[PDB]
Amino acid sequence: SQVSTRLVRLLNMVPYFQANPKVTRAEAAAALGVTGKQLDADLDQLWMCGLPGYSPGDLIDFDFVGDTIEVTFSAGVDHPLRLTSTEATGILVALRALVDVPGMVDPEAARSAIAKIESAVGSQRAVVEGITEDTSAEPGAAATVRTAVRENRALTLE
Amino acid sequence: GDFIEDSEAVVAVDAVSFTLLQDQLQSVLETLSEREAGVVRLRFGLTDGQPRTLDEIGQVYGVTRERIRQIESKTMSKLRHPSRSQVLRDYL
């Protein structure tokens, strides 16, 4: 439900703040896709909860420098929560659907992402799989189109 | 029964060390403001025998819990300065 998603986001905020030492308010809001007031309320709620015993040196403590967020005591929160079956399956399905679409994404990048996600989550051959291990059907026009899009250069198409 | 050591007896060295630690901690806390010193004493339970909770202190001082947490964080950051920790380094 909504409460479960809020709990997951609040629990995973700490590793995100640890990854970026001086992430600003705007970057955090864009990353989490939430309004400023909601992010402030979640930050306040996360600030006053931590280790049992409830000592100021035991619970989670921050360090506000102007409009920047930094973590000084993770209170044991060092890694983000694992990936559930549904979200991992959806991500794999989306990647394997978009790998076959020409020009939207590089096939090598999609294959690397699939391999890394499968290694991280420990999936096996009993999941969604593609048709061709190596396409090799691209004539190189898609790469040129993507390069022209990225660099904003003139392109000739027949 | 004459070769069994009583492990619950006072070592007669931790008592004097703890007394000196309390005196030194009071001396260090005397260098702060009244508000921060009172907040730290109430939160850590240095006052009489036991600690309190963040909401309780916020209600007693009539301020928001966010303000109490910010005050405690600032005080702890200040107390981590080497000047106020060099004296207490040898006690740990």
Side-chain angles (χ1 to χ4, degrees):
Chain A
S1 179
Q2 180 268 353
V3 180
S4 60
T5 58
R6 178 182 181 180
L7 177 61
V8 170
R9 179 256 316 280
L10 190 144
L11 181 55
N12 288 329
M13 274 196 302
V14 179
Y16 170 76
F17 286 156
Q18 187 179 0
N20 304 90
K22 206 173 183 179
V23 47
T24 61
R25 289 293 207 275
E27 292 290 341
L32 276 64
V34 296
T35 62
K37 183 178 60 180
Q38 172 66 19
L39 188 142
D40 175 72
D42 295 355
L43 194 64
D44 152 60
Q45 189 62 224
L46 176 62
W47 200 1
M48 317 197 64
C49 176
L51 188 73
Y54 295 85
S55 299
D58 295 359
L59 61 103
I60 304 179
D61 200 335
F62 289 146
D63 178 67
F64 290 90
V65 183
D67 292 356
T68 60
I69 301 179
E70 190 181 3
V71 288
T72 59
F73 196 87
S74 60
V77 188
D78 189 64
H79 306 270
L81 206 149
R82 59 164 55 182
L83 290 80
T84 67
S85 60
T86 61
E87 54 187 350
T89 303
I91 290 299
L92 294 181
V93 165
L95 287 179
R96 295 188 182 274
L98 265 63
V99 63
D100 295 358
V101 185
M104 289 193 61
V105 63
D106 307 5
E108 295 80 6
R111 287 184 173 88
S112 301
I114 286 293
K116 290 189 181 60
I117 291 182
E118 183 176 356
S119 61
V121 79
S123 285
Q124 301 297 333
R125 302 297 182 181
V127 304
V128 50
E129 63 178 4
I131 170 66
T132 61
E133 295 79 8
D134 295 323
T135 55
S136 300
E138 45 179 0
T144 306
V145 167
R146 294 190 302 270
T147 304
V149 171
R150 181 177 294 100
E151 302 178 3
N152 297 270
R153 301 181 64 179
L155 180 60
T156 300
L157 295 177
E158 183 177 1
Chain B
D2 297 0
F3 305 143
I4 301 297
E5 170 180 356
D6 183 13
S7 59
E8 300 293 337
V10 185
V11 209
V13 62
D14 64 332
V16 52
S17 299
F18 184 80
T19 302
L20 267 65
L21 178 59
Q22 281 188 330
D23 297 359
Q24 185 69 22
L25 184 51
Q26 180 182 3
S27 299
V28 169
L29 289 182
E30 285 182 2
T31 60
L32 296 173
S33 178
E34 51 177 359
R35 292 285 302 276
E36 285 72 12
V39 166
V40 170
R41 284 191 176 93
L42 293 184
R43 193 57 177 86
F44 277 105
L46 293 177
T47 302
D48 44 359
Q50 38 74 29
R52 311 303 300 181
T53 326
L54 294 155
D55 59 335
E56 306 173 354
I57 300 179
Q59 294 173 1
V60 166
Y61 286 156
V63 290
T64 64
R65 300 189 299 105
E66 296 80 12
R67 196 66 180 95
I68 286 294
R69 188 50 191 166
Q70 181 180 2
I71 288 178
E72 293 182 6
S73 181
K74 291 187 301 180
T75 310
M76 293 302 298
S77 181
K78 290 172 57 181
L79 265 57
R80 289 184 179 90
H81 190 272
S83 179
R84 298 184 181 92
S85 66
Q86 180 64 25
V87 289
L88 305 178
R89 169 72 273 184
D90 290 325
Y91 291 103
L92 180 58

Short mmCIF file of all heavy atoms in Angstrom, two decimals, chain B residues 24 28 31 77-89:
data_model
loop_
_atom_site.label_atom_id
_atom_site.label_comp_id
_atom_site.label_asym_id
_atom_site.label_seq_id
_atom_site.Cartn_x
_atom_site.Cartn_y
_atom_site.Cartn_z
N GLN B 24 35.39 16.01 35.53
CA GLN B 24 35.89 16.56 34.27
C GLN B 24 34.75 16.83 33.29
O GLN B 24 34.77 17.84 32.58
CB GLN B 24 36.90 15.60 33.65
CG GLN B 24 37.57 16.13 32.39
CD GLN B 24 38.51 17.28 32.67
OE1 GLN B 24 38.99 17.45 33.79
NE2 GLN B 24 38.79 18.08 31.65
N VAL B 28 33.77 20.39 31.65
CA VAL B 28 33.62 20.60 30.21
C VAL B 28 32.26 21.20 29.89
O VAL B 28 32.15 22.14 29.10
CB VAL B 28 33.86 19.28 29.45
CG1 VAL B 28 33.44 19.43 28.00
CG2 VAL B 28 35.32 18.88 29.55
N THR B 31 31.50 24.96 30.09
CA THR B 31 31.94 25.85 29.02
C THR B 31 30.87 26.09 27.97
O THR B 31 31.11 26.88 27.05
CB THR B 31 33.20 25.28 28.35
OG1 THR B 31 32.90 24.00 27.78
CG2 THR B 31 34.33 25.14 29.36
N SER B 77 28.04 18.05 17.67
CA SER B 77 29.08 18.44 16.72
C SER B 77 30.11 19.36 17.36
O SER B 77 31.31 19.23 17.11
CB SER B 77 28.44 19.12 15.50
OG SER B 77 29.42 19.50 14.56
N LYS B 78 29.65 20.29 18.20
CA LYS B 78 30.58 21.17 18.91
C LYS B 78 31.46 20.39 19.87
O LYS B 78 32.67 20.65 19.97
CB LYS B 78 29.81 22.26 19.65
CG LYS B 78 29.15 23.29 18.75
CD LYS B 78 28.25 24.21 19.54
CE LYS B 78 29.00 24.91 20.66
NZ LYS B 78 28.11 25.80 21.45
N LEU B 79 30.88 19.42 20.58
CA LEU B 79 31.64 18.67 21.58
C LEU B 79 32.63 17.70 20.96
O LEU B 79 33.49 17.17 21.67
CB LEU B 79 30.69 17.92 22.51
CG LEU B 79 30.34 18.64 23.82
CD1 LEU B 79 29.73 20.01 23.55
CD2 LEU B 79 29.39 17.81 24.67
N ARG B 80 32.54 17.45 19.65
CA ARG B 80 33.52 16.60 18.98
C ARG B 80 34.78 17.36 18.60
O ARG B 80 35.70 16.75 18.03
CB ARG B 80 32.91 15.95 17.74
CG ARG B 80 31.87 14.89 18.05
CD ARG B 80 31.36 14.23 16.78
NE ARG B 80 30.37 13.19 17.06
CZ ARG B 80 29.07 13.41 17.14
NH1 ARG B 80 28.55 14.61 16.97
NH2 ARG B 80 28.26 12.38 17.40
N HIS B 81 34.85 18.65 18.88
CA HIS B 81 36.05 19.42 18.59
C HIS B 81 37.23 18.89 19.40
O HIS B 81 37.05 18.49 20.56
CB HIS B 81 35.82 20.90 18.90
CG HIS B 81 36.90 21.80 18.40
ND1 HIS B 81 38.02 22.10 19.15
CD2 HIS B 81 37.04 22.47 17.23
CE1 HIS B 81 38.81 22.92 18.46
NE2 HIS B 81 38.23 23.16 17.30
N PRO B 82 38.44 18.86 18.83
CA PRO B 82 39.58 18.30 19.57
C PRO B 82 39.87 19.00 20.88
O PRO B 82 40.38 18.36 21.81
CB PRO B 82 40.74 18.47 18.58
CG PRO B 82 40.09 18.49 17.24
CD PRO B 82 38.78 19.19 17.44
N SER B 83 39.57 20.29 21.00
CA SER B 83 39.84 21.01 22.24
C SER B 83 39.05 20.44 23.40
O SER B 83 39.57 20.31 24.51
CB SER B 83 39.53 22.50 22.06
OG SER B 83 39.77 23.22 23.26
N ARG B 84 37.79 20.09 23.17
CA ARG B 84 36.94 19.54 24.22
C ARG B 84 37.00 18.02 24.32
O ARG B 84 36.36 17.45 25.21
CB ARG B 84 35.48 19.97 24.00
CG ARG B 84 35.27 21.48 24.04
CD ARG B 84 33.79 21.82 23.92
NE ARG B 84 33.56 23.26 23.94
CZ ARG B 84 33.51 24.03 22.86
NH1 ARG B 84 33.67 23.53 21.65
NH2 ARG B 84 33.29 25.33 23.00
N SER B 85 37.75 17.36 23.44
CA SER B 85 37.88 15.91 23.48
C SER B 85 39.27 15.42 23.88
O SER B 85 39.42 14.24 24.20
CB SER B 85 37.50 15.30 22.12
OG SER B 85 38.43 15.67 21.12
N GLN B 86 40.28 16.30 23.85
CA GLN B 86 41.62 15.88 24.25
C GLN B 86 41.66 15.46 25.71
O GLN B 86 42.33 14.48 26.07
CB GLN B 86 42.62 17.00 23.99
CG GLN B 86 44.05 16.67 24.37
CD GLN B 86 44.63 15.54 23.53
OE1 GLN B 86 44.20 15.30 22.40
NE2 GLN B 86 45.61 14.84 24.09
N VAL B 87 40.94 16.18 26.58
CA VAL B 87 40.93 15.85 28.00
C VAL B 87 40.24 14.51 28.23
O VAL B 87 40.65 13.73 29.10
CB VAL B 87 40.29 16.98 28.81
CG1 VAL B 87 41.19 18.20 28.83
CG2 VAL B 87 38.93 17.35 28.23
N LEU B 88 39.18 14.22 27.48
CA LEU B 88 38.40 13.01 27.67
C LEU B 88 38.93 11.82 26.88
O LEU B 88 38.42 10.71 27.06
CB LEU B 88 36.94 13.26 27.28
CG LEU B 88 36.24 14.43 27.98
CD1 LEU B 88 34.82 14.60 27.48
CD2 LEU B 88 36.26 14.23 29.49
N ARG B 89 39.92 12.02 26.02
CA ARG B 89 40.47 10.92 25.24
C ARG B 89 41.04 9.82 26.14
O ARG B 89 40.82 8.63 25.89
CB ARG B 89 41.54 11.43 24.28
CG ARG B 89 42.38 10.35 23.60
CD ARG B 89 41.59 9.59 22.54
NE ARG B 89 40.86 8.46 23.10
CZ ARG B 89 40.15 7.60 22.38
NH1 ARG B 89 40.06 7.71 21.06
NH2 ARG B 89 39.53 6.60 22.99
#
